[model samples]
Target chain A: DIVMTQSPLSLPVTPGEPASISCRSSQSLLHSNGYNYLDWYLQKPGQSPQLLIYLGSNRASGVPDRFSGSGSGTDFTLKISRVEAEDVGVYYCMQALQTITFGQGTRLEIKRTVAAPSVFIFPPSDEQLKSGTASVVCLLNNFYPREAKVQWKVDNALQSGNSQESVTEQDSKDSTYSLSSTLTLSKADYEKHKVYACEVTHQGLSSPVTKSFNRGE
Target chain B: QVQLVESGGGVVQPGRSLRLSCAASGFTFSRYGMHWVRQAPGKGLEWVAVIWYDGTNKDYTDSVRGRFTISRDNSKNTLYLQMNSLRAEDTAVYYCAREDWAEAFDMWGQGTTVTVSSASTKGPSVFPLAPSGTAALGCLVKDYFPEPVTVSWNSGALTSGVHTFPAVLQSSGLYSLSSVVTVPS
Candidate 1:
């Protein structure tokens, strides 16, 4: 049997917010006919599962346009354009290529309103720069729905490595969370007046939140 | 742990036939249906044929509707795909898969490769057909072996609205086929 695995077993989303789930198959689900031969379904509370997308991405009869399926071969994604109050359910991805196998279900639930995270850039001190190399830090604070995308860019080019992510921390009094990412580079490159930027992406924010720092600043 | 191993592949001359088989293990042979799939060299996968576990039901794709047959022997724990009228374009890698309601083709064989050759046969002669419409053109091919050949229009390689009829046997021990293509009228 082809095993199926899913990520983010539990998803917490705010009404009107978009969401997505990932499913990976042990074997390629692509059929000889050029279709993934996978299906997506949702099982609501006390109800039988309903087919939302079939044959990889074809919407089943009467399925809303907001629900979509994408990807092929081994990796697949199911996306909801917007979460509704009644959307709480268990979502499953099943493969029908040879033998039927299903991914572990992802549970979706409504959470309190999400708060956009604040981004801050901390430049390395002049003393640290003297050591031949230095690090810049990006701290994201006060975001709901813990998962986020954080990256460090240099001179508008993507920085490959020398970065670490602080384990997401939740506020004791509220569900808000925070995380920090750091990038390290040699002072030789830093002295080139290269622009360094921190880009943060979260469902709570309509667009990626960016903060940039330059040696001149 | 389910495993499938396919066998039977060879170079066959045009107008000949071929048989391919898949032997399965690690599970009940009678519990799942068997499927035959193929991919022409450098082309997409093609649905070949399928037969139910009990051998009571079966189906085939339009391209191989009458030329291909699928069968299984539970006692041997194997499935078979028999194809006739081999053509150069029929050369492909054939795969066998196990299927059930819950697990649609969940397991597959490593695949067997087959090739069709017509080195001994000469190319056919082409004759233009009587014009049926202002935009329509057709050609008749005769005295060909390996049974069939691809036909396309000079205006477009796509050959849209073009059809090549099945090869017809003649008393001269040769084969004849015809194709027609219609452009914007």
Candidate 2:
């Protein structure tokens, strides 16, 4: 009676590339019968789900040989040899103990070929921080291709050593990616006229995806 | 060519009941067993209940065994899941799937969405016991939350409590967390 959970929320994978999804159970998946009850499934957007793995390592009926599974104990893996465009969807793991439980899904998406993500800006949104400090976040969502180099420009100047963190995530249902860059600003900038910009550089973009914001706008 | 459509997803209040169903087409309903699968907010998929094609066997996750029922109507080539004691955590997307042990849940239904209020959980506090009946009374946190949680005790103040537990997902798709404490007499 253990729980199952997954990670990375989403994955950005290129066509003809290999991708793997992880599943961990609270307890060992090994059973008394010498068989592990781990299972794998795929759920495409707007559709239900399809079975991919059963009994730890076997592929279900009609599944492409490209889809395979392997694992032991509390850990399991579902891997695809070369990702397919049609494979873009949410992937999940399940355990068939006397009861059945499933893992949170990990979406497998086709790597971005050329679509660009947009950035949203939030400044000193907290009422308390409104006067004393400013926390800014620039988000890039649904951009194609993985590993976009995201940078921030404040007041039309390259701002360095100001990043709190940067995060990239795959869509929960699809394989697209979203990224966020965070920076802290002095209270003066929020009160004075200052502009903020998020610039995203990806291979597909002839020009980087960029967005600008101001205190008034 | 095979199709499974799940429907009857609707909202429910705490203390009420809800029933969801799946209809299979393009294949023999008795060819394989059907599973009731669900996905909650942020959590991945969960197999709630299942019924075999021939209508001879039924299985349910322990978290739902008592409050939920899985049944099938052979004439209609359909399966049903009726769950009681609804909660907000139960708000999730549900799908019906078919699978065999060699391969596992391959065919699925389109899915239905249900929303439940009052799914947020409450208390897991401890109350001390009587004097000398057991030195200092034992403490317990009960009927609080479910799914998975990280519990940190300020060991700086009190002796550590011994526990490593797996949570049970509630009827509302929430975690039902309850743990007991024992003080050495």
Best candidate, DockQ: 2
> What is the per-residue lDDT of model 1 for residues B46-146, given as tens digits with 9 covering 90 to 100?
55777888997788866677888889999999899888888767888887877645434556677788878754465786655433222544565645764
Q: Which tens-of-lDDT digit does each residue in B80-126 have in candidate 2?
A: 98979976667789888786644367677778888776555454433
Q: Chain A TM-scores, one per candidate?
A: 0.52, 0.57
Residue A60 lDDT in candidate 2: 79
**Could you give candidate 2's per-residue lDDT for residues A16-105 as a string of tens digits?**
889988898999989888889888878776566677788889887788989989999888888888887878888888887647777778
Report how far off residue A152 is in candidate 2 (Å).
14
**Predicted model with the maximum TM-score:** 2
Per-residue error (Å), model 1, residue A183: 52
- In angstroms, give how far residue B117 of model 2 lies from its true place: 3.7
Q: Which ten residues in a row have the lowest lDDT in candidate 1 chain B?
A: B128-137
Cα lDDT, model 2, residue B13: 72
Which number leads on lDDT? 1
10 residues in a row with least lDDT, candidate 2 chain A:
A164-173
lDDT of 2 at A106: 89
